[PDB]
């Protein structure tokens, strides 16, 4: 009616809570957000998301403990003093998060194409407070690379290291490079990264 589709939008562990207004909704409706840890009793008010008019709230910091699962709830208060509360399903960032394209740098040579993957930092802090990378979080994470030459012939490499080099290439030629992140444990697959490159002259 007033509140609908209360859910987390998760990308590279940036967790944003979103929702819609239902049938009996209106534009002057204000929203207040609370969140809690599954297995705990109390709800905590989200300091910056009280009586707001927007329809999204950043809960990234509040849901950054990779060992916990959480819940969030929005309370809508309509023009008439009418209210309504709805909460998300149990949230697991490790499970729901989407992965952005790998941080890759394609370096072209005379007869080979080189691809360097760089660690992708996340908001997840370690004890010492520094940022953990996707590799730090997903131990079985591995990359799937592909070098296209034409509609009928593609080269492919894969592994957990950062640097890859496709050999046996003809100089001054164009190739389409594609790299994606794969984490089997959670059946996740990142958006592909594509770099169109050309080998040097000779």
């Amino acid at each position: 009616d007033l509140l609908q589709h209360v859910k987390f939008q998760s990308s590279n562990f940036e967790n944003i809570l979103t929702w819609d207004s239902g049938p009996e909704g209106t534009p002057d409706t204000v929203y207040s957000i609370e969140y809690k840890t599954y297995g705990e009793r109390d709800w905590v008010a989200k300091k910056g998301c009280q009586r707001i008019t927007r329809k999204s709230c950043d809960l990234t910091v509040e849901t950054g403990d990779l060992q916990e699962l959480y819940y969030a709830r929005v309370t809508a208060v309509s023009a008439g003093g009418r209210s309504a509360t709805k909460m998300t399903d149990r949230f697991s960032s490790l499970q729901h998060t989407t992965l952005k394209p790998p941080d890759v740098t394609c370096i072209s040579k005379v007869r080979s194409i080189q691809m360097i993957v760089h660690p992708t930092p996340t908001p997840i802090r370690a004890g010492d407070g520094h940022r953990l990378t996707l590799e730090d979080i997903f131990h079985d994470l591995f990359y799937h690379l592909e070098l296209q030459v034409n509609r009928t012939y593609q080269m492919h490499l894969g592994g957990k290291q950062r640097e890859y080099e496709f050999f046996g290439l003809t100089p001054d030629t164009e190739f389409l490079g594609t790299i994606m992140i794969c984490v089997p444990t959670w059946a996740k697959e990142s958006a592909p990264y594509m770099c169109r490159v050309k080998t040097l002259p000779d």
């Binding site: 809690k36 599954y38 297995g39 705990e40 009793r41 060992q67 699962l69 819940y71 399903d89 149990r90 697991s92 499970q95 089997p184 444990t185 059946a187």
Partner: protein
């Protein structure tokens, strides 16, 4: 031994089935104050004994949770239980080279919480089959 091939968890269909069974039950679980399976379950359990502990949880879950609720949450229940059952069987020959105290106590607290919550506790357990699945995966390789 206490270990399970990685291939037991790499299968998309049976895994999504487990997670969907877990999700359907969690939507039915209204108690957000109590979490059965978590890091505290390992409270004082050596890293080399976690798989053994998860064998116990899995066995209990199969006998006091799934079976009693084999009628509800269809059609996922029907395909997941036999899957978890095989994993349980695989671990039937897993033992620890030490005393079973700090572990037994830990598993008992879980059995106790589930009993005290009654039928809703069994529902809660099913809604946490995703946590069980992963704890089971990380502990037994």
């Amino acid at each position: 031994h206490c270990r399970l091939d990685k291939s037991n968890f790499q299968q998309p269909y049976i895994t999504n089935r487990t997670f969907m069974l877990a999700k359907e039950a969690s939507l039915a679980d209204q108690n957000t104050d109590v979490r059965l399976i978590g890091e505290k379950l390992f409270h004082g359990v050596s890293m080399s004994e976690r798989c053994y502990l998860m064998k116990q949880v899995l066995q209990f879950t199969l006998e006091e949770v799934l079976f009693p609720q084999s009628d509800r949450f269809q059609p996922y229940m029907q395909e997941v239980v036999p899957f978890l059952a095989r994993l349980s069987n695989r671990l039937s020959t897993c033992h620890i080279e030490g005393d079973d105290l700090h572990i037994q106590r830990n598993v008992q607290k879980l059995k106790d919480t589930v009993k005290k919550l009654g039928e809703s506790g069994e529902i809660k357990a099913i809604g946490e089959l995703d946590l069980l699945f992963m704890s089971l995966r990380n502990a037994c390789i």
